[PDB]
Amino acid sequence: DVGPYSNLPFKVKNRRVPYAVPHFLFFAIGMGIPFFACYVQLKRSGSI
Amino acid sequence: SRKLILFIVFLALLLDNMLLTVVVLLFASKATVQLITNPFIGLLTNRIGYPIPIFAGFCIMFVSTIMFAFSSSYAFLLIARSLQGIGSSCSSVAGMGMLASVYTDDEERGNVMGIALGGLAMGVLVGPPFGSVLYEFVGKTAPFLVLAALVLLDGAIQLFVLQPESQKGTPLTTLLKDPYILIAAGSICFANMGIAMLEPALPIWMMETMCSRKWQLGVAFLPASISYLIGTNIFGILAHKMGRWLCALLGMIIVGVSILCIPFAKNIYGLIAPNFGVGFAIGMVDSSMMPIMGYLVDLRHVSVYGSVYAIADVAFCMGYAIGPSAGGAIAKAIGFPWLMTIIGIIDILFAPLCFFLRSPPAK
Amino acid sequence: TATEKIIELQKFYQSTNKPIYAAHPRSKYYLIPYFGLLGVSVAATLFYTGRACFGIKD
Amino acid sequence: QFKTATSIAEVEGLENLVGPGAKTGTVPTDLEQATGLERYELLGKLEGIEVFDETPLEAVRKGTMKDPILIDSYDDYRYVGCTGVPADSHNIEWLKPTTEKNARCWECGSVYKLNFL
Amino acid sequence: NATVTNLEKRWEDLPETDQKDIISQLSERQKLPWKDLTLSEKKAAWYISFGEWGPRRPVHTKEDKLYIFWGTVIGIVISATIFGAFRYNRNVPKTMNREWQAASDEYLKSKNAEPFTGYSQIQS
Amino acid sequence: DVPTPWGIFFQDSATPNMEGIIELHNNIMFYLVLILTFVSYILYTIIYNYSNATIVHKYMNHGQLIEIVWTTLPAVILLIIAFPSFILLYLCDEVISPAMTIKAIGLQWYWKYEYSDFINDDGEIVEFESYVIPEELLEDGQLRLLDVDASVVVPVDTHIRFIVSSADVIHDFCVPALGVKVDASPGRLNQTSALIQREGVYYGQCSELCGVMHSAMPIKIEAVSLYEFINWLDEQ
Amino acid sequence: SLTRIQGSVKRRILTDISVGLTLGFGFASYWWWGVHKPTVAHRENYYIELAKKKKA
Amino acid sequence: MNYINRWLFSTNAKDIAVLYFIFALFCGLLGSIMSLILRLELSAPGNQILMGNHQLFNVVATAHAVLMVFFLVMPAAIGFFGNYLLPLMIGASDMSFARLNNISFWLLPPALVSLLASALIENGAGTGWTVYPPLAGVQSHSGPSVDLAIFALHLTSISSLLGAINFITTTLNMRTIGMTMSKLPLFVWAVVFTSILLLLSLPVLSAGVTLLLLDRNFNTSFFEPAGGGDPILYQHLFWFFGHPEVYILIIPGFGIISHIVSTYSKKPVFGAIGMVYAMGSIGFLGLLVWSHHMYTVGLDVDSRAYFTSATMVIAVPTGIKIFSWLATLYGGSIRYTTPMLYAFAFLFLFTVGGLSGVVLSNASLDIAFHDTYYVIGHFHYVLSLGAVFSLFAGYYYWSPLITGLYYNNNLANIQFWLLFIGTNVTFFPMHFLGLNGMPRRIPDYPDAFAGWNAISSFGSLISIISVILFAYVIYDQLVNGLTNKQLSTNSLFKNPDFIESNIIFNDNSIKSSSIDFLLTSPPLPHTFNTPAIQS
Amino acid sequence: MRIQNRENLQLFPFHLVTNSPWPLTTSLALMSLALTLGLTMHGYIGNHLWLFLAISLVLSSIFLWVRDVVIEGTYLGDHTIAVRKGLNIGFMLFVLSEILIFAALFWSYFHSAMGPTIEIGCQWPPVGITSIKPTELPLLNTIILLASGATVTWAHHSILYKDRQGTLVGLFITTLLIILFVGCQVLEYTWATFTIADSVFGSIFYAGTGLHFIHMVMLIVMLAICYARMYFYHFTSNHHLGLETTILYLHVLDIIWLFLYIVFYWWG
Amino acid sequence: EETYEEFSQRYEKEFDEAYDLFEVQRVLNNCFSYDIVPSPAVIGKALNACRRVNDYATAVRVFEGLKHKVETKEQYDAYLEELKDVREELGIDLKEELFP
Ligand code: HEA
Ligand SMILES: NCCc1c[nH]c2ccc(O)cc12
Ligand code: CUA
Ligand SMILES: [Cu+2]
Ligand SMILES: [Zn+2]
What we know:
The complex is a heterodecamer. The radius of gyration of chain C is 21 Å and the shape is rod-shaped. With 58 residues, chain C is mostly helical. Chain C is built from two helices and no strands. Chain C has a domain at 24-58. Chain F is α+β, with helices and mostly antiparallel strands and 236 residues long. Chain F is built from three helices and ten strands, in the order H-H-E-E-E-E-E-E-E-E-E-E-H. Chain I has 268 residues and is an all-alpha fold. Chain I has a domain at 133-266: Up-down Bundle (Four Helix Bundle (Hemerythrin (Met), subunit A)). Chain I is globular. The structure holds heme-A, serotonin, dinuclear copper ion, copper (II) ion and zinc ion. Dinuclear copper ion binds next to loops of chain F. The PDB classes it as membrane protein. The entry lists the keywords vmat, SLC18, vascular monoamine transporter, Cytochrome c oxidase-VMAT2 complex, Neurotransmitters, Serotonin, membrane protein. It forms a decameric assembly. The entry is titled "Komagataella pastoris Cytochrome c oxidase in complex with human VMAT2 and Serotonin".
């Protein structure tokens, strides 16, 4: 089944949920993790 | 200067093997001329002064190396080898003499001389050729030449621009009279002979049984090169504390043991370790015997130390002069393992002679 | 048979049609214990690295 | 798993490379225990045939369309590297001759053809 | 004449089976001695081989530099707006005032500071 | 001295060492600017002439003289630069007669100052501790995060030898105008020297990271005349 | 004649190396004679009034 | 079951590169956002976002350094571009040790959990990227946080060591029929040299860091001055690893650029053998100079001269390389595709970044520039503008050949200009701040340093918007990437020469000097069945 | 390449490994070990039975790797002249990496040896710290290690000349003569009067000596495996890559011990 | 290292043996890739080589390459005043006269 969509670990076409959702959640989680740590360590030392 | 003489001896040792290894009989001729010219330089050091023989060796190296590169004629190559030998003796003898001169204290001499004598391995590792056939080969030595000049700028600026009673004594016959003086020299010879006998012949045997290509032949000797520097640097310190005579005896012992262990190996992996042992033992003996000779001459003679180092240089260069080809000639009748066996047994038998230097005789 | 089953095993390990780490009838012993204990080890390090973020000690 | 081969003429696969067994009480040899692509090499090296060749491509003559350089391959294509007729003049160029076309080497002009085996 | 006249405006829209026909009709017509070829044939022979179609189009057209320029401007305006919004709502300490950065000047002038290029703490 | 709002260059110097540093920096920037202009001009030429060029020179690939020259020229540049650096390194130091000794211990988040001389028979060595004035307590016109309650005082035109050590962690004693930057290790004594040529106030800050209150441990030096020094010392 | 051209890239190489070095010295000899020396003169002249005032 | 046996229990060397890429994207996003968090607090004087907590500022700095030296550049430059491109270029089926490649990948996801958990279980690990002992002891940092950040530098070290062994062994005995070890392309030489540096430099870091761990939790007194120890020892044992690392990050970049400059300027590289010798010299001189990181600790006056002499000497090989790049670019034809723009930007930015190193190699001047944003401005030009640009160029160069899907030219150009502008506005004013005397690692500054710090918090918001646009560019590459090869002739690997007709060009389209661009659109899982031949 | 039916066998002499689950499992085991060890030393766990389980899982993973590495060479027969050379090169490159860690400890010893701090009296091994006499059990270990190094060469020459009883005896004697080294050096940690935390001498003496202990336990395990795999007829007279890999390791360990005896015991 | 009179012999003999269009374009591609402009004899052989293989665009693009290789305009006018018999005998028309 060699082809141009076959070497990637994820499915891109003929998919129930459109690919934009998995693509956006990846970057959202990646760019939102570092704010969670700051929130956690700010709420632990009294300051807001 | 102290730092200046350290740098000078380091570069003097470094350039010699750089010139030596590059290749486009001759070795024997150069070593023979080096043996012959040495006592004349030793005599010259007394009257002319130390810096002149050091300065001469540099121009001698330049003329010899130019002959090698620009000349393919046999006669010019022979002249280059002869001047290489003669000149080196100037550089080595004067460098060792003044290195002892500035470094007066007994303890510091060992560490300084170990740092200095580590330069021989650096020379062989740095360039198998130096200034070899293709232009990019002077695209490697160019960075290091700049560093050498730049450090010499430090030395010169310290001595010249800003802040950093000779005695006629010890005639050469008087030097030869001391048997104590002789002992170290003799050992020094033995070790040199051993590596030397090994150099031509070992590759030849490998060709016979190992079934190894030329790259294995070249790479066999790298562990010895690393071992020499490691052992010299460590035991230049350790010799004073543990007793210099004990270090000499032990090092001769490991020389013999490694020489016996070498033949039995039938694979390169067995070949690797004995080379390291040989390197450590030879570095041990060299670092042990070099400083001790000046101490001996100071205790039992006046402090004019030039010829003693001439005798030392004779001991080092006589082995490379004769013995490399002789070891191979002995082979093919004595065979591969018997030569190393006899060398190691000779080393073991000769080892107990180091005991006499343990307590310096009263004088 | 004799001490040389080296030849017989060879015909077994070729075309066994099952991965070479689970083809022998003894593979079970090595792996029913091992896989199971790794799960316990991995589930016992994630219960304490979340129980440490909340400040609960032992 | 089947009959054991005696030279590299009766080896039709991986089924003719098992061999007999050593006897109890002796260190076995390479000719009594060797199974896969190792015994194949061992059999090849005992009669003079090199199973795994290491001969770089021919660099004697150039190649035209009427008489091209023939390159053997068990596939429909093969990767070829060209450096010239005296063998180090042209810089390295890579070509893919196949069974429907010939490579031509934009610089020097040699033509390569694919021979199916 | 109609087939070859004005290939510069129609040629790229034709399929790949009507292209080989023109190439094959310009091959059995070029073998004849030249000067027997019409001008349109010469122009078409030049255009088919060395012309600004297919793999000789430019990397950038005249309408692409405008797109890139106005994209960069739009990407910079967003950053300017966000930094302004994060800039208005600041914690301004008591030292950042013009009436305070004048008294520091008197102190720094009583003890001569920066006799060379200059001293001044005023940035409002 | 004090930092200035839109700074671009060094602060005004008050020691010969800092003058030497400025001269050496301006001597190196010469050759660096020359090299940068060369490379930029070549890139401009390549963009201007050889953009979508019809002729490609695919046989100019070896060179033999130009490779000698881009290997030898940087070497001479390096040697020219290295000469003055070595002179400045070996020459400038406390060659003769240090005239005053100050021990500056760096505790966790404040400094402790001892004046090694000026000792009576009972051990009354003049000593004090320098803190940082918080923002809520600043007076009218005092600099924030740079003003200390007790300031080091020294005479002008006298060698000052600072001996630096530490008691908790690795600190750094720095005063940019005087050209002093030495470390404060937990188990060793370091030493630096300075000569001040004019009277004024000089501010500095710590360098090596030490924890929470790294951004507040300022250093402040005044250079008063000899008479004001005697008056100040006859009160402490 | 006019139909025999032999070497033209070498001359361009020489002219490009001979313009990128003059420009460099022009841009670096302005660093050391317009931005460095005047500062040194100004500093020295400031130090040679502060001793006259002390002398008085 | 086919899924697990092909993406979890993996043996193919080209299927670990894609996992490496997907991991590096995540670990770079984390680091860039941590940089944004730091750069918003240094915007105007006071305590703005992080309310008053000076811990949780050093934590962010340490995490930003660790996540983005050890988790982005190394995995992307050795994990993605090594494992995928070295076997194709030299002609090998796979790596010699496949299972070691699989473990070298899989040790990373465990190593990220340790670093993330070292920032949530207590006050954190605010020790700096360089963990000096007496601050990273038990008196200041008392918890399982420095300990867990030490364990993330052990697993990464194991992965790097195993990859280095695999590369050196695969390039020594696993080549094609007529490839001697002087016909190798430059990229393979770069990978080999960086692997040698990795072998000789990592054990020292392992020893130093484990000694620190033992001192913390077993009271062994290696670096405690009350039992006979010196903290300075740690510094030695760190920087022997410290300086080789900065070359391990840059040597893989250089080779990449060579390929680009040899493709879009249709000319072979000027003095390839000179290039290989120069990389050898740069690698070798990078082990003999480690103490220019510590001039203010109180070294001797004779060792300073050696370290100022031995640091300047590296200029000669790098200068040779820059000049050879200009020479190879000179006579040829230049076509401004998106890899070539990054190639041009690298040549100027790296030169500007490295010219500042010569000003810091001197011992006399380093009394004014140590622990200051001059050093930060120095190394971000050579790290952010030298290595990240190379990674972006390599992506834009080999992405079509791996995925088979093309990308939009205009959006890529927009991203390039945005990142250029942002990185130049963010890292240049640090030079002025450094010369005027602003120290490192401080959350709050005096009021003098306000103005420039308002300009440098403006470039971060341009660079991050460039990153978001890069995300969209990947999205539009994956979807509708098959129809994107006809928008611009950027898709062509090499345009037709002057006298080559288009008809002849279409039959013979690819002319290359390496195997990479002869392979199929996604290279086949088993790509070499019959061996390749050279002459 | 013109042998008759050549397409029925592979055209290149390299090993395409099958899919294996051991990398991921070893990664998980190390992850669990790291987290558990980082937590247990600061509270948060209490019980110590999780660390030991993690260590055991790591070791079991390595052993199950080696099972496949032996099956792929003695039963399937995928080890040609190329793959063997690659394995040897890799082992050398791993051994070099172990060697350059002892260099760090030696440099740590020489940095404190020359330049002792003011806090300790300026003297090596300081007052109140009695060193270990080098005319004692430290001298048995040198003799036993040299005898062991000499006894394994008789085992490699008894396989080349086709002797079975004559290779088992040598390997057994070598194992039983390295266990004696380990035992002597494990009854020497109980007859010393200076601990890890008494000075910098006692923190580095043990660091260098301690690493040697583990590297010798590895040798004991390897020699036992070599005996067990020879008793079951796995080794041919010209294809034996376990014996060479275990012989190159023993010699390096002996060379290292002769430096740990010259710099740690005599000098002081 | 080659002289002008060896270059202008090597490339004439090479143009006298091109047998397809690929070969004529190949030899023409690396003739205009040196530091020496081809002499009028070499271009004269090239035009005949194009006439045997039966291609017209190559014969017109040869004269367009000279406009870019030559440094100035007097040299370009000098070339066209010597290759005037060949153009009017074979039938080649310049690009400036076609306006394609
Ligand atoms: C990865 C990028 C990178 C690279 C490649 C290098 C390599 C070099 N680095 Fe390294 N460096 C870092 C990033 C990098 N560094 C980092 C991050 C640190 C530590 C920061 C920290 O600890 O906080 C560091 C450490 C560090 C320091 C310590 C500064 C301090 O005291 O804190 C210094 C200077 O002292 C320095 C300078 C150099 C130099 C001169 C090079 C040379 O390799 C560069 C040479 C380049 C040129 C010379 C270009 C030549 C161009 C030509 C046209 C030749 C012309 C010839 C001449 C100029 C004469 N680096
Ligand atoms: N005394 C020099 C012994 C020696 C040891 N290693 C060497 C290498 C090369 C050489 O020429 C000599 C040596
Ligand atoms: Cu505390 Cu700095
Ligand atoms: Cu550095
Ligand atoms: Zn060719």
